[PDB]
């Protein structure tokens, strides 16, 4: 499928144990997608001083369409030193892997994979 929904576990940053996907714009794409198909993957809301706590290159789930069966439609986009790779709509998060952490909330997204 070109889409899969997912209902993705959404973490407080302060909880997060590990703090990005990897060091390369190529790589943080490539293991967040993984973690997307695995169910391996949180989401942090980005609000004033989250992302200073991340590490980059980020990835943002951003929306892709204005939501089937409550789904909203999103793709990746990476960021490196302010530059993005990708072009998408407004952030749902940042994501990172999920190793267990205890979630405040899920947000259902319709991945396009």
């Known amino acids: 499928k070109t889409h899969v929904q997912l209902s993705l ?14 060091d390369s714009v190529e790589e943080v794409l490539s293991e967040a997608r993984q ?11 980005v609000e004033k001083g ?18 089937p069966h409550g789904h909203v439609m999103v793709e990746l986009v990476a960021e490196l030193e302010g530059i993005q790779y990708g072009r998408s709509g407004e952030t749902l998060g940042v994501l990172v892997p999920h190793v267990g952490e205890i979630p405040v909330a899920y947000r259902k997204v319709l991945l396009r994979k």
């Open 50 to 67: 989250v992302l200073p706590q991340l590490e980059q290159p980020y990835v943002f789930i951003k929306r892709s369409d204005a939501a």
């Open 9 to 22: 576990p959404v973490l407080q940053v302060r909880d997060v144990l590990v703090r990005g996907f990897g």
């Open 35 to 45: 973690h997307l198909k695995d169910g391996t993957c949180g989401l942090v809301e």
